[PDB]
Amino acid sequence: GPKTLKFMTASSPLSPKDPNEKLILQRLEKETGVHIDWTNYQSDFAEKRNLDISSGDLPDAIHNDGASDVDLMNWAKKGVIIPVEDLIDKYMPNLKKILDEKPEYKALMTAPDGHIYSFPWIEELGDGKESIHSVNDMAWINKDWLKKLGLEMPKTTDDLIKVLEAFKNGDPNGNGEADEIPFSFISGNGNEDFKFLFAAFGIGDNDDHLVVGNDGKVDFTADNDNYKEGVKFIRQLQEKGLIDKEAFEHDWNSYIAKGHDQKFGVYFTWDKNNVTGSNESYDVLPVLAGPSGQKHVARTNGMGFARDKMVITSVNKNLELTAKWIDAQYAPLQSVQNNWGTYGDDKQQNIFELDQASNSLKHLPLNGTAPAELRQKTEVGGPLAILDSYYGKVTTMPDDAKWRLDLIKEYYVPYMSNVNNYPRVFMTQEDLDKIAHIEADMNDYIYRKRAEWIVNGNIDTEWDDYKKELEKYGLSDYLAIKQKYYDQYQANKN
Template sequence: MKKKLGVLSAVVLSSAMILGACKSEEASSNEKVEYNEEGLPIVEEKVSIEMVAPSAPLAPNYNEMTYFKRLEEETNVHIDWNNIPGDGYQEKKNLMLASDDLPDAFYGAGFSDHDLLTYGKSGAIIPLEDLIKEHAPNLNKMLEERPEIKSVITAPDGHIYSLPVAAEMDIGATPFFTSINTTWLEKLDLEMPTTLEEYHDVLVAFKEQDPNGNGKQDEIPLSFMHMFWTADIADLIFGAFGMPDNLDHRTVRDGEVILTASQPEYKEAIKYFHGWVEEGLVDKESFTQDISQYLAKGKTEDVTLGSYVWWETEEVVGPDRADDYALMPPLEGPNGDKLVGRANGSQYSRGAFVITKENQNPEVTMRWIDQQYEPYMAAQNFWGPIGEIYEKDEDGKLVNKEIPEGTTMGEYRQKVAPNQIGIILREHFGTVVEMEPRAKQRLKDLKNIYMPHMAEEKYPKVSLTAEELDTVNRIEPELIDYIDKKRAQWLMNGGVEEEWDTYLEKLEQIGLNEMLEIYQDGLERFKESQK
């Protein structure tokens, strides 16, 4: 096998000698090391690389995951993980970049387009296109088979600063599924609601008629998580007024980029829903609760949850109660509207992995990460390793094992799968890996319940120039923060009609029109590139 030899500086060599007594068989991350250009292991002498990664709430340190233990055994590359809880990751990542206190790489990096261009230009993260070409045969193969993925990860300046993540499952058209307690419906002799008015009456019954039978008024008719990506009322309420919302508050209508949160339908939806809050039909913690609090509400000793928004019924209420709930179809609003928003973006994402200027072994790092773009490895990264989530059948396909009793697939996956890196193409399902039962069900639900009412347009994954990103990043954070605060305030306390004109003026002052113009230009360029 071919090898390349890096030169150790005197300083690094001295440091290595000092540490040698306790770590003689492992090179530290600030040494340039020999590596194998092909085959495994990647290095003959174990090397350590420092990586920062966000982690799910139930995830252990990544070194405790079977997936990474096996990867280390095969590659001889040890990762010094700094796992940061997902809800605090972006802030800590930004502090590291601002203070120039960098690891060798960010894994599951979550770098925005602005991050990529800013820190690519400054040199904090390095271009990857040559490393991909020379040291990433698995990823290269994927980019050849799906050139559109290469387009997504190529920056306007022509460089590739980050690696992609993609699973062609078509399950992300909308994340907002509403589940309702059908056992309570039957007990109270109620039908599945089809309109907002009917749903309102159901919520009143849930509140007042003691459907759990414990003699207490402890039922929660409706709970959600305000502006959370799988738990908001963006479709449930706003869609019933013909203006489905999303976390961007941005969509496309008849080819024009618009802000959902400045439309009259948005105002009417807020005014309508506030009435439900005043009646006590809505869990007031919906505006403040975190994931743990939210998921716990479906697992109380007495059943207390009447309906909720989450893209998997079972994950909220647990496997023992899942059969007591069913998905509620999109509801018709007072004006006859019944629309489901189509999620912005693409199945292909950039920003998943970056290598920093501190990395002395980018070739080793690229070879290590490329192992995870091999389809079998990518499947295990997304959903879990062989022996815990999967076993191989007689055709070599990864098929699902039974998960431990008393847990849900979503919870179990957090513990065993990083779910950060890889590409699974549509043709890999049924050949390399069996589609997860939850995903099969979600596709079925999308097709039967949501797609017939889904908006045709969305804002795609576009690339903005550095100058455009500078402007958007000056305007959009303040704009979104203001919108989200007013949305929550009006939903809880009312006042949207009285404050609406002042609110629209404030949006313009922050820079709404300038931002929309940039997004429109980006959309037009995207359309032109697809011809």
């Protein structure tokens, strides 16, 4: 009969209480000869895991763990988890092949002490500039309104102002009311913010306020003259009555209610399908030239990467067995299914069909509750890797991802002039704490001033003191830390 290991795991409440009732894990046990005895936490995973650690009720490994860098460091320092770099080298050819094709991931996996403490989740949907993550807050425009008013798609920021004024005053939805909301967003971090447009003024902005210049120097975006010009542009929209009166107050629920009723002229989101719906009334606002005549897209620092989806505890007495079980998860067909679902179940719907001859997966069309729930019911998460080279060989790409990737490529990639973005480096505990403190102090301040400058005005007079305030919060130290890790990554990434 099979060898045994005890794993703690995290899963969706829609999935079975015993993970071994999943088809993926049933097949896996047949292939590996290993029976997993699961401790499956389906809610409050982090708290339940932390109580187990402080009690000394440790499993052999924690699967689908998602811990922070701070957590990994603490657990390593206390000897709760062990270094695994030697286990990779000796026992894990699938993971070694990934790290050989993509040595940047090895650098991301390695702590500054030189050890690896966890096994990552890697999901590439596009590579480099073409990554689906490169732009999060895409701008969308009402093409029905443009046609009705007989307007061309704007090419410049000044054209956009003229179009928004026509949306404001022209009653493009034809109901004789001034109900059109020309420009809307949900202010701050995330997919519904306006900061995408700042790059029209040069350099631009992202949720980290950090880009990497082609000179190799990290740049804080929110103290640049370019950023001030961006803010002054959004202020112009505000002064002209073009911004949603609730843009700084509303929540996602309110935003999508107004979106569902097609009240927006121009708005921001990840995918228009979640806001204005699956229709042709809205399309991508192309990249606009600013007053300079030039076009730019700032890259986010987003990446389909999580450092820890599995750690091995200090009580594990079967390291070779464990490493081999983990390595089976990094086989390409296994990684794809673990991430997204499986094939061949006669008792419920399937995310995939397997082509027997080619041994490759194709996404199936889904019905009923399956679009909403089937992935959560059938995926397993945990450590895995899907590389951009797998698409068309091992598996199809999800249709929605493919659609978004192609828009990114068509509209944005030509204007992403930065060779690099900022890498997801693993910092020391001391640096982690310093960076956390600085961000806790300055992040809300940056957004508060930005909002005030738009709703009240006065940026020209307040700009110099604002930059001084950022330095009081430690901006120069922040940047030196970021630059230090960037430079180290350049040395280690090959």
